[PDB]
């Protein structure tokens, strides 16, 4: 049922900007915190950002703070990662994520398809 | 200001008295029934101008003479019916406040699973209207899976008070456990955890509630005032009942507990600290509930004012709904319902410690003291027996009737009668000196104007306009029948008529055999009135 589909990747130069979108479907997404992760080549899957159900609290990785801005439009069932002041080390496959705790002692991470960002 | 870790333990022991089910369970539901914007101004007016004065009066009155809620009516023996009235209030509380604890024990035990049952619509109790926070076009009249768990699994709610149906054996098992833990503790009769665990637990659910979409609609409905609902006497009656109830006024336990307090203790200081932190706690517990109602509003597709217009049960629809949006959700549910249990049992302990003490003080000393355990047992047995219909299939219809009538404005009129009896029959002049004998300073002028003029004036007009404007009680659009509201009035005045009934009895027993001088003989203080052995300026 749950699906996540990212778009907005590609080649960009250092100092550039990209906005990644994640389109979510198959669930009442307004009830869920949404997350962004990135998998750099030759590196383990790393956390980047998280956003509250309403967008009141938004949290970032220390290596991203002040550079990227996470936001959401719950009518469109989307969460975005606005990337600014991009640097070569930001080159990674960016994955959209939601963790459904299911009112239980554990969560199922549902993963998006992954969208490549490449910074020259 | 720092006090070598000693006074801060006196602050935290005080804080543990201010937080209770009277504000974690009871304040949010009344606040919603009245509609938050309309409730907050009357609540603050009645707490400032009536509640705090009557709380300080009940503390002082008991501390000074050092006698229980009955034996303190030695200022004017005719009014001992005020004390018996407070025992009728306390006995209406004890029976129903243990079924509030049944429901807490049921949700605590029910939390011992892999998945919280109230999270989804895939269960057998659910209707086709179940919306689902985690779970085409289905329904015109959507519901929360937590409203259905409460209304169709916990309590298989009948359509009427008359349909008692069958008793809920699991809830009745919890009534047994609730009355055992209470009774066993009355034989056994660390502060930091009791005084802080409610606040860290409420803060978790608050930080959760704030982060949900539409929370601001719930908060806005809570805080934006309704200067249009202001002439409804029912709003002022409910606000008065909550302001007196949540402080323990006219339950008589305050007087009885204060009788054990040191004669020179600062009962002014303790009244401000308890009542201010109680006020703030109530507003906080209400804030989190309303931040959750704001979420249920856009999740169901309706105005916040009609999402969950319950009575008892709002805390069992709303807090459960929020818990399913926390990570490791059943851990926090076990900790949350354990917090409710240890908040509830702590007030039953103080209520039943009081009730037994006053029943012993009333009777011939030795044999009734040998009976101390047997009478406490007799109270817990009788408290289980009188609780059975509240575990029936009609249970909460009676729970709202006891809480909205037997234990509501009756507390305000019983304490108003005391206010006038002390201020005008005994004499304010005499009473303020009596306070000054133990505090060293007179009451602040604020309490002097409040006791003498404001409190009887406000209470008298809320009483008069409630009689003029009364409407039949409703639990979420079930309108109560004629016989049920008549029982509501009988429970409500069962505790008040105790006053004139004892007045007739003394005016028969007393010496005089004349029209009015027997009333003067009956209203002036007893020869034994005042404090114990050494503490006399007049004696
Ligand atoms: C907040 S609530 O849940 O709405 C609520 C309502 C009524 C309550 O009890 C009233 C009662 F205590 F009277 C009772 F339960 F006995 F009926 C309580 C409740 O447990 N207590 C309030 C309160 C007040 C104190 F000042 C007090 O100690 C003082 C120690 C020094 O000497 C003077 C007293 C101790 C208690 C405990 C909570």
User: What does B94-160 look like in DSSP terms, one character per residue?
Assistant: HHHHHHHHHHHHHHHHHTSSSB-GGG-S-STT--TTB--S------SS-B-HHHHHIIIIIS---SS
Resolution in A: 3.4
> C-alpha B190: how far from its chain's center?
25
What's the rounded Cα separation, in Å, for the pair B259 and B271?
15
Rounded distance between C-alpha atoms, residue A44 and residue A64, angstroms: 17
Name, in order, each residue with C-beta under 8 angstroms of B400's C-beta and a sequence gap of 6 or more. B311, B312, B473, B475
> DSSP secondary-structure letter at B48?
I
Q: Do the beta carbons of residue B19 and residue B340 sit within 8 Å?
A: no
Contact flag B211-A105 (C-beta cutoff 8 Å): no
State which approach was used to obtain the coordinates: X-ray
Return the residue of A nearest to B323 by Cα: A103
Cα separation, A79 vs A20, whole angstroms: 9
Residues whose CB is less than 8 angstroms from the CB of residue B534 and which lie 6 or more positions away in sequence, other chains included? none
- Cβ neighbours of residue B68 closer than 8 Å, sequence gap 6 or more: B62, B83, B252, B255, B256, B259, B354, B357, B358, B361
| Test mutation, B113, B123, B130, B211, chain A, max A CBs within 10 A | B211
- Between the CA of B40 and the centroid of ligand 1 the distance, in Å, is 23
Both tokens of residue B346? Answer: 């702590």
Query: Which tokens sit at B477?
Result: 């659009």
Dist CA B184 CA B196 (whole Å): 25
Q: Kindly compute the dihedral angle of the four CA atoms of residues B12, B18, B20, B22, in this order, to the nearest 10 degrees.
A: 180
* B270/B11 Cα distance (integer angstroms): 9
Contact B21, B282 (CB under 8 A): no
How many domains are there within chain A?
1
Residue A16 belongs to domain spanning = 3-119
C-alpha distances (whole Å) from B372 to each of A42, B302, B340, B376, B377 are 76, 55, 29, 6, 9
- Tell if the CB–CB gap between B298 and A30 is shorter than 8 Å: yes
Hey, are the CB atoms on B114 and A104 less than 8 Å from each other? yes
CATH number, domain containing residue A22: 2.60.40.10
| The pairing of beta strand A92-100 with beta strand A108-111 | antiparallel
Q: Which residue in B211, B216, B326 is closest to A57 by CB distance?
A: B211
Task: Find chain B residues with C-beta within 8 A of A35's C-beta.
Answer: none
- Residue B38's nearest CA partner among B235, B309, B312 is B235
Ligand 1 atom having least distance to the Cα of B25 = 3
- Give yes or no for A1 touching B (CB within 8 A): no
Contact B211 A53 (CB under 8 A): yes
Domain ranges of chain B: 1-539
Query: Are B360 and B369 spatial neighbours (Cβ–Cβ below 8 Å)?
Result: yes
Sheet holding A78-83, edge to edge: A3-7, A18-25, A78-83, A68-73
Q: Is B346 exposed, middle or buried (0-12, 13-18, 19+ CB in 10 A)?
A: middle
**A69: contact with B, CB 8 A cutoff:** no
């Amino acid at each position: 049922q749950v699906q996540l589909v990212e778009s907005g990747g590609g080649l960009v130069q250092a100092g550039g900007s990209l906005r990644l979108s994640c389109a979510a479907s198959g669930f009442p997404v307004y009830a869920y915190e949404m997350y962004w992760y990135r998998q750099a080549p030759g590196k383990e899957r790393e956390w980047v950002a998280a956003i509250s159900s309403s967008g009141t609290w938004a949290g970032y990785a220390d290596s991203v703070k002040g550079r990227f801005t996470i936001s959401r439009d719950n009518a469109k069932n989307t969460v975005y990662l606005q990337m600014n002041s991009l640097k070569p080390e930001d080159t990674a496959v960016y994955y959209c994520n939601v963790k459904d705790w299911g009112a239980s002692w554990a969560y199922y991470d549902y993963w998006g398809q992954g969208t490549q960002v490449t910074v020259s | 200001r720092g006090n070598w870790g000693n006074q801060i333990e006196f602050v935290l022991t005080s804080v543990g008295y201010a937080v209770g089910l009277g504000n974690v369970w009871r304040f949010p539901y009344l606040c919603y029934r009245n509609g938050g914007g309309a409730f907050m101004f009357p609540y603050f007016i009645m707490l400032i101008f009536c509640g705090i004065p009557a709380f300080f009066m009940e503390l002082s009155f008991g501390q000074f003479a050092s006698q229980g809620c009955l034996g303190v009516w030695r200022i004017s023996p005719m009014f001992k019916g005020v004390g018996y009235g407070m025992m009728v209030v306390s006995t209406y509380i004890g029976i129903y406040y243990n079924v509030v604890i049944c429901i807490a024990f049921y949700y605590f035990f029910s939390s011992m699973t892999h998945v919280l049952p109230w999270a989804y619509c895939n269960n057998p109790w659910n209707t086709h209207d179940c919306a689902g926070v985690l779970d085409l076009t289905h329904s015109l009249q959507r519901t929360s899976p937590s409203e259905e768990y409460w209304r169709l699994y916990v309590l298989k709610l009948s359509d009427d008070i008359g349909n008692f149906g069958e008793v809920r054996l699991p809830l009745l098992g919890c009534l047994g456990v609730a009355w055992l833990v209470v009774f066993l503790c009355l034989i056994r009769g660390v502060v930091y955890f009791t005084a802080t665990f409610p606040y860290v637990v409420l803060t978790i659910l608050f930080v959760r509630g704030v982060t949900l979409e539409g929370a601001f609609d719930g908060i806005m409905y809570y805080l934006t005032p309704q200067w249009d609902k202001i002439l409804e006497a029912k709003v002022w009656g409910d606000a008065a009942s909550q302001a007196f109830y949540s402080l323990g006024c006219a339950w008589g336990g305050l007087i009885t507990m204060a009788s054990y307090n040191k004669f020179h203790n600062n009962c002014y200081r303790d009244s401000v600290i308890i009542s201010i932190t109680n006020c703030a706690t109530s507003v906080y517990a209400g804030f989190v509930i309303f931040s959750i109602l704001g979420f249920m509003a856009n999740h169901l597709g309706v105005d916040v004012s009609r999402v969950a217009d319950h009575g008892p049960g709002l805390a069992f629809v709303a807090y459960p709904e929020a818990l399913t949006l926390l990570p490791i959700s059943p851990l926090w549910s076990l900790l949350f319902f354990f917090m409710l249990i240890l908040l509830g049992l702590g007030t039953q302990f103080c209520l039943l410690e009081t009730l037994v003490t006053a029943i012993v003080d009333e009777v011939g000393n030795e044999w009734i003291l040998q009976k101390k355990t047997y009478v406490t047992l007799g109270v817990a047995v009788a408290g289980f027996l009188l609780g059975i219909p509240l575990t029936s299939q009609a249970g909460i219809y009676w729970l709202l009737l006891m809480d909205n009538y037997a234990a509501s404005f009756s507390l305000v009129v019983i304490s108003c009668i005391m206010c006038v009896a002390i201020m005008y029959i005994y004499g304010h002049r005499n009473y303020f000196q009596d306070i000054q004998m133990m505090l060293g300073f007179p009451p602040p002028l604020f309490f002097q104007i409040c006791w003498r003029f404001v409190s009887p004036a406000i209470i008298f007009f809320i009483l008069v306009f409630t009689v003029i404007q009364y409407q039949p009680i409703t639990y979420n659009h079930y309108q109560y029948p004629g016989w049920a509201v008549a029982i509501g009035f009988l429970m409500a005045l069962s505790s008040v008529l105790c006053i004139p009934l004892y007045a007739m009895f003394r005016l028969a027993r007393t010496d005089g055999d004349t029209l009015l001088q027997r009333l003067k003989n009956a209203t002036k203080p007893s020869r034994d009135w005042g404090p114990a052995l050494l503490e006399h300026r007049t004696g």
